[PDB]
Amino acid sequence: IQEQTMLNVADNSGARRVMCIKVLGGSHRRYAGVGDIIKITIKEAIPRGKVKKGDVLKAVVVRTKKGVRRPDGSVIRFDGNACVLLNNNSEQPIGTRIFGPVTRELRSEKFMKIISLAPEV
Amino acid sequence: MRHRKSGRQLNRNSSHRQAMFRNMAGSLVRHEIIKTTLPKAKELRRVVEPLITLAKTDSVANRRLAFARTRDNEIVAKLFNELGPRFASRAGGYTRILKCGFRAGDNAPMAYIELVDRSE
């Protein structure tokens, strides 16, 4: 969601705060939410984990505050933005487990690996 | 643009338009006639009529509330008692306007707010 914007990690390894240094998807692309690809920059990381601080990879937004409305109009909004890191060059998640509930927006046959984890929606 | 916005602000805080209208409405309930400004009347209009309507019914309930607006615990008597049952049948046109306008100092257009039943 726009440059900066500190979002939590919905997956393990390289936990805590991580900054979005870019919104991929075209020129002037203002903000990003629902389930878009975002250029992240690990700003916290865990002592061990798999990805240490300073790292600049990519991630997918899993939860936003502006929620996500569907047909009927009803919207679904979580409290606190969150994303999930993933291999830079060829997409797909880096972590193994995904914390917190997700959204049916990721049911895309390209993010399946995530919605297939415990949580919800 | 004010598109579809009701209410006149005359020219002062939402405070003035709570006193220069309260002291007026109460001043109207008294003499039943006034030579105020046309606008300062067409507005005062939907200030007393509501009170009069509220005056149709007695009860400490629709009394103290009537005391809220118009702090004049005196004119409240004029209401419920005098012009209270007076218009206890009118549809709401408890007020007349009688235009005339044009004051001395300011070319401001005055009027003549008056209870529909003032003539004797």
């Binding site: 047909p71 009927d72 109009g73 | 643009m1 598109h3």
Partner: protein, 209 residues
């Protein structure tokens, strides 16, 4: 084909048995009795003037009721042409209804407009607000540099700069049709058409594909 003159008064949902909520402006077309036909040998083209409402038979000027009575009189808001071709209609108010846009899915909807009036850039031209702070004297939100200099000398026309914003045809094109429910002069579009209720709209099949 030709279109009909309606009256804005919509904006409401219409959920589907699938689980989707469809927006829509409720245009009302209460018959459009053709008040006059225009010939190319008598006039110069192929059109069909119509009406929909009915004045209080009071404001109707004789010159008005004179044109109505001349044909299928019945008063009405105003007169509306409808350039047509390769197919005419019975001169006298043949009466055309919403059932016209039956096997139709185009529609355009041509209301009046918004009505801002005030104008001023940043709103009528989506300009950019200058430095809200960091100095900036009496220039937070203003035009700023309209021309160039001596070489140009003047100020090219069209130069975006404030000016009345509102009241002006502005169509829409497209807008999938929902229901042409007649017997109540009702027609529903996809949503968001000009005007502000009680407005005169000219709904017709989209000239575009």
């Amino acid at each position: 084909m030709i279109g009909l003159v309606g009256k804005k008064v919509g904006m409401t949902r219409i959920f589907t048995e699938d689980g989707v909520s469809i927006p829509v402006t409720v245009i009302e077309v209460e018959a459009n009795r053709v008040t006059q036909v225009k010939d190319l040998a008598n006039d110069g083209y192929r059109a069909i003037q119509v009406t929909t409402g009915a004045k209080k038979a009071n404001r109707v000027t004789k010159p008005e009721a004179g044109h109505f009575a001349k044909a299928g009189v019945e008063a009405g808001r105003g007169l509306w042409e409808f350039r047509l071709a390769e197919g005419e209609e019975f001169t006298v108010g043949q009466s055309i209804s919403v059932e016209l846009f039956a096997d139709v899915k185009k529609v355009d909807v041509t209301g009046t407009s918004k009505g801002k009036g005030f104008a001023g850039t940043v709103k009528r031209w989506n300009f950019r607000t200058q430095d809200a702070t960091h100095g900036n004297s009496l220039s937070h939100r203003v035009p700023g540099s309209i021309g160039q200099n001596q070489t140009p000398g003047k100020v090219f026309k069209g130069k975006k700069m404030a000016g009345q914003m509102g009241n002006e045809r502005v169509t829409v094109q497209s807008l999938d049709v929902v229901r042409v429910d007649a017997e109540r002069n009702l027609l529903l579009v996809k949503g968001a058409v000009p005007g502000a209720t009680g407005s005169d709209l000219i709904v017709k099949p989209a000239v575009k594909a």
